[PDB]
Amino acid sequence: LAAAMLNLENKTYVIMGIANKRSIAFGVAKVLDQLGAKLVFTYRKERSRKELEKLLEQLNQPEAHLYQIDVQSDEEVINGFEQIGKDVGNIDGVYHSIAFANMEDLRGRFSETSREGFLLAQDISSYSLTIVAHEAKKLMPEGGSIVATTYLGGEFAVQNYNVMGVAKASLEANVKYLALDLGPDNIRVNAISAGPIRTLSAKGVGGFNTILKEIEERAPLKRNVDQVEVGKTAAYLLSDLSSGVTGENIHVDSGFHAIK
Amino acid sequence: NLENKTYVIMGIANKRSIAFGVAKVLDQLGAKLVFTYRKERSRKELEKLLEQLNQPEAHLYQIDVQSDEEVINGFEQIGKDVGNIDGVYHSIAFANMEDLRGRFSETSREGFLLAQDISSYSLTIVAHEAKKLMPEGGSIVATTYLGGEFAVQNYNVMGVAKASLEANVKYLALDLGPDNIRVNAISAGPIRTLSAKGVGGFNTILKEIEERAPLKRNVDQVEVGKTAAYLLSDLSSGVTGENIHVDSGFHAIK
Amino acid sequence: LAAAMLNLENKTYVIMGIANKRSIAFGVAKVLDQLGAKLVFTYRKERSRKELEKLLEQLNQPEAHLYQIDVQSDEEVINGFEQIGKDVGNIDGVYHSIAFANMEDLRGRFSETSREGFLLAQDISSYSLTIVAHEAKKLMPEGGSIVATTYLGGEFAVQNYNVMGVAKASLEANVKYLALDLGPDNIRVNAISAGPIRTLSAKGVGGFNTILKEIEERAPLKRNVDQVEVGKTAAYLLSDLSSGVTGENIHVDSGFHAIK
Amino acid sequence: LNLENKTYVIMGIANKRSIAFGVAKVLDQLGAKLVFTYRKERSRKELEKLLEQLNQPEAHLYQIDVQSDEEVINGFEQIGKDVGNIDGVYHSIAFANMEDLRGRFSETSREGFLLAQDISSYSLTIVAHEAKKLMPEGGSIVATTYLGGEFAVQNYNVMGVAKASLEANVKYLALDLGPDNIRVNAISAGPIRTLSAKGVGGFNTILKEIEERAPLKRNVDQVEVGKTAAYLLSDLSSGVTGENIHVDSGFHAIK
Ligand SMILES: NC(=O)c1ccc[n+]([C@@H]2O[C@H](COP(=O)([O-])OP(=O)(O)OC[C@H]3O[C@@H](n4cnc5c(N)ncnc54)[C@H](OP(=O)(O)O)[C@@H]3O)[C@@H](O)[C@H]2O)c1
Ligand SMILES: NC(=O)c1ccc[n+]([C@@H]2O[C@H](COP(=O)([O-])OP(=O)(O)OC[C@H]3O[C@@H](n4cnc5c(N)ncnc54)[C@H](OP(=O)(O)O)[C@@H]3O)[C@@H](O)[C@H]2O)c1
Ligand SMILES: NC(=O)c1ccc[n+]([C@@H]2O[C@H](COP(=O)([O-])OP(=O)(O)OC[C@H]3O[C@@H](n4cnc5c(N)ncnc54)[C@H](OP(=O)(O)O)[C@@H]3O)[C@@H](O)[C@H]2O)c1
Ligand SMILES: NC(=O)c1ccc[n+]([C@@H]2O[C@H](COP(=O)([O-])OP(=O)(O)OC[C@H]3O[C@@H](n4cnc5c(N)ncnc54)[C@H](OP(=O)(O)O)[C@@H]3O)[C@@H](O)[C@H]2O)c1
Ligand SMILES: Oc1cc(Cl)ccc1Oc1ccc(Cl)cc1Cl
Ligand SMILES: Oc1cc(Cl)ccc1Oc1ccc(Cl)cc1Cl
Ligand SMILES: Oc1cc(Cl)ccc1Oc1ccc(Cl)cc1Cl
Ligand SMILES: Oc1cc(Cl)ccc1Oc1ccc(Cl)cc1Cl
């Protein structure tokens, strides 16, 4: 009004990991756009470029700056972020919403996990944050905010989660280490731990429907969450409201983290 | 982010009170505020301190959280005077000087229980009474410290009272989440306040944050009030039982 | 058969909180008794004095030394421990297995808890470690080890547990503060976080039967724990085998803590 | 109690001051038969001399580089064939490139990150798989971690992320393998002067901090870790699994 203490209006954020309209990264987009932020979107699959194009109705007026980045490729993220920088100039944060593991590994007994599948999960689900934070920083000379999305399975052993649990525990340590390293550069680093939400990747998690229902009967709030509730915490964490907050993990999960 | 909401802020002593940073932040965001204080002789710092933008009173009620009557009658009166409410900010704690000074194993039964009473149980009754004024739901926030999670040098009995308060929060959040009332804590980094004088070696704890916290700077009262505004508002829709550390990232290191 | 790594065998341990033979503290006594230790027992109630005398076979010779101590009274625990010292000389540790809350409270909606109810639970389940630790330390000139008994309800908001949940978060912080304080005195202080066991006190917990069957179905080891399992970890903590362990909380719970 | 008739595979001995050597000493004294594994020829030759000690052969020294599926599978089959089936594994293996640990976390190379995970974290997963084949009635697996897996500690970097991963590996393994009556647990050891420790920047300051700030006001040694390991490896820790015990003078529990 200005209740720009948010300060996020006419600042630019990069949102990585929109697949389709149920993507967590999409509820983030929706909430930042509404608050006046300029947005740059990166994707891996050509199908996700098409959904982005159709999705950007909504309020951003170019492009909304659609770049192709596979986090497995050092080259693609170095050169993707260099190009963002040349095309829109400097950046104020990044929302990271990228994970992957093989369906077979997740199914599927943990002690049987292959080396390639263990390491693939760490590659895409954890390390990607680290090169991404490194390349993005370059476009952030007076600081900024990076936010990654995690699951309670990085903190506790959860039934069908297997190798992804381990990849999230690793993501979560990566966040604190990036926070200590990038803090003197006025960069904040944080995670949202989201409750379960029906998305494209979610149907690769076994017993997914049973866990929805557990939150419903068991979480403090006796409901589950949606993408725009994550988006609203992303907005806090990306804004100046979270000024004093780094290395932290915010559960947007109806309070399930706090119970039994 | 907006006006139209009424929040009760408990625990302003003066201009450096954490609950004053909260006040300021909520006032700028357009909230109507209600203020509690402990003793009738300091009603007058307080009205004087409250310029600021609130237009009456701003609704000042005397509540010593040790009395069951005073919390009940107090909130009763608040609902009568201003109607019903959106949230509460809790920023009260106390322990005896001689307890915190003071080897922990030497603590007395009554000084132990006094810290528990004032720093912990008060969130319980206040949440019960405040709920009566929150028929669509709302948000309750309490202020805690790192010494509730970890044994910290001269914190002693308050350390145990804060871990009490932190478990207090989680349980209230379970009990009250069906009523649509969310309950969260903010673990604040060290801030120079009137009550800070009771914490031994305070210079050394601030210098430690500068040298060691990710941010390499101490936090302020308004920084707390900003995370409080997130917590109190709809911004934090799915969050309850949580403890947001507003402390330059110190909770996360070594 | 030296251990003698354990270093338990001609040593005196005060055991507080035996009601009958299914008391978690009785699991402790049978295990230290087996390991060669001298034992001192404290009771509150009369009913436990007759319970204790009969129960005290086993292979402990005198009384073995039974003191009435009600942890609500400063005098009882100062004089109690002062008597233990006159009668047996100095001591090597304390097993603390004492807690109480009004059943009306745990019943029970947490926000409705009375102030007397809440402070009662704190006094007995939490403050009691602090004077006991203080009074016993006067019999441990050379150092020593003190263990209290906790529950997952101290870390997570659990359905029928309420004010006791809050009293166990407090106890656990009490163990950490006492470790920091008493460490330079070479007194280690630690907690065991026990899973559910059918004891006389377990009556006070609504739906105990249900939290029994959940451990068995969900806990890594797919089974419940018994009192001698807690006992063995208590031997471990009381012994020199845990020589470098202080302020710690060990979960004897089949792995329940580590999941979901 | 606390005895013989048990057989433990101990992995990660380099020299007289390897943490796992402290574990070996403690177990050796408690009557166990010890099988040892090593990567470098250098370490085998340190093992042979260290074996004086009580163990009467070999003790059963096996070359196993946890980087090859093939060597951990073939090594454990051979351990099977040579000493029969087993009662537990003590795992003390970790690696990171020195450049990394120096060395600003945000600059970490992809390949340095995945190397830390491969050797420091995944190794427990396959070790557990192959070990389990020699433990038809159950047993106990212990891995060695460090507070830096829980908190961003100064020069620790890529190794802290690999221990965070390790620490989760233990919990998920515990859940998977607990029906099979196998317990899995970690010991979070305080800082101790070992071959690999001198790869950690400012170790010497991270030593003296424990002595001034830890409840106990001293650091620990390899044998204190071996006494906890002895607890975890034996039935004395019967109901305990997916747990992390800090043998660190209480450091984990303060400020
Ligand atoms: N939904 C839930 O309950 C659930 C529960 C808890 C925590 N989380 C966390 O939420 C985050 C986002 O997932 P979502 O549920 O919103 O699913 P989503 O719609 O399926 O999208 C996941 C995104 O990951 C991207 N991605 C995968 N590998 C990539 C690579 N190598 N390079 C670049 N992008 C890659 C995918 O890109 P392409 O489509 O272009 O391949 C996709 O856009 C995940 O990190 C998840 O781990 C979600
Ligand atoms: N300063 C910090 O470093 C610090 C940092 C970390 C987290 N925490 C937590 O933040 C909270 C607020 O403290 P502060 O530092 O902002 O100090 P503060 O300005 O001195 O405020 C403390 C408030 O507690 C009130 N209070 C004490 N006993 C009471 C009782 N029986 N009934 C009603 N009110 C009572 C005091 O009222 P009167 O003065 O009017 O009597 C005072 O207004 C406390 O909960 C504290 O434990 C504070
Ligand atoms: N049983 C379990 O499932 C269980 C499980 C997980 C964690 N925990 C924790 O385990 C601990 C041990 O209880 P338990 O289950 O073994 O039950 P128990 O056999 O009922 O023993 C409880 C002991 O508390 C004593 N006590 C209560 N108030 C006292 C006082 N004011 N002064 C002296 N002694 C007092 C009782 O003595 P009198 O009968 O003579 O009054 C009794 O000896 C409790 O602290 C509990 O909080 C318990
Ligand atoms: N010392 C400390 O204070 C420090 C303390 C905090 C926690 N921990 C944890 O302690 C554990 C044991 O280390 P330590 O300090 O005792 O070090 P150490 O004596 O240097 O032993 C490290 C061991 O790791 C083995 N290793 C490395 N890469 C391997 C590979 N690819 N395959 C098989 N073995 C491999 C080494 O074998 P080769 O020599 O044959 O190459 C060596 O025996 C580590 O996991 C560490 O992370 C130690
Ligand atoms: O589960 C996933 C699996 C993959 Cl391969 C990729 C993304 C995923 O996202 C999630 C979906 C549902 C829940 Cl409960 C947790 C997470 Cl991390
Ligand atoms: O310390 C206090 C002591 C009392 Cl008797 C009352 C309030 C207090 O408030 C604080 C001030 C500074 C820090 Cl570091 C932590 C806290 Cl809980
Ligand atoms: O629950 C209790 C309640 C009271 Cl009034 C006294 C002792 C208790 O002891 C217990 C018994 C069972 C479980 Cl599951 C947990 C605990 Cl702490
Ligand atoms: O530091 C290490 C570095 C490497 Cl590459 C391998 C093993 C190590 O072992 C340690 C030694 C000291 C401390 Cl404090 C922590 C750890 Cl994990």
Short mmCIF file of C-alpha atoms in Angstrom, two decimals, chain A residues 16 24-25 28 95-99 125 129 147-151 168 171 190-194 230:
data_model
loop_
_atom_site.label_atom_id
_atom_site.label_comp_id
_atom_site.label_asym_id
_atom_site.label_seq_id
_atom_site.Cartn_x
_atom_site.Cartn_y
_atom_site.Cartn_z
CA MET A 16 12.85 -23.47 -11.87
CA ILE A 24 4.36 -26.44 -6.69
CA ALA A 25 6.55 -24.00 -8.66
CA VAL A 28 4.83 -19.82 -6.36
CA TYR A 95 12.86 -20.58 -6.50
CA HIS A 96 14.17 -24.14 -6.89
CA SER A 97 11.61 -26.93 -7.51
CA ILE A 98 13.56 -29.65 -9.13
CA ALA A 99 13.93 -33.30 -7.89
CA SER A 125 17.83 -33.23 -6.27
CA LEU A 129 20.98 -26.24 -5.97
CA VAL A 147 14.48 -21.08 -1.76
CA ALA A 148 14.40 -24.88 -2.38
CA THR A 149 11.45 -27.29 -1.84
CA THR A 150 11.99 -30.39 0.44
CA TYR A 151 9.88 -33.19 1.98
CA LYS A 168 16.37 -34.45 0.58
CA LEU A 171 19.43 -31.01 -0.03
CA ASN A 190 16.22 -21.55 2.73
CA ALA A 191 13.80 -24.40 2.28
CA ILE A 192 10.11 -25.00 2.36
CA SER A 193 9.23 -28.45 3.53
CA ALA A 194 5.90 -29.09 1.73
CA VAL A 230 3.66 -23.05 -0.52
#
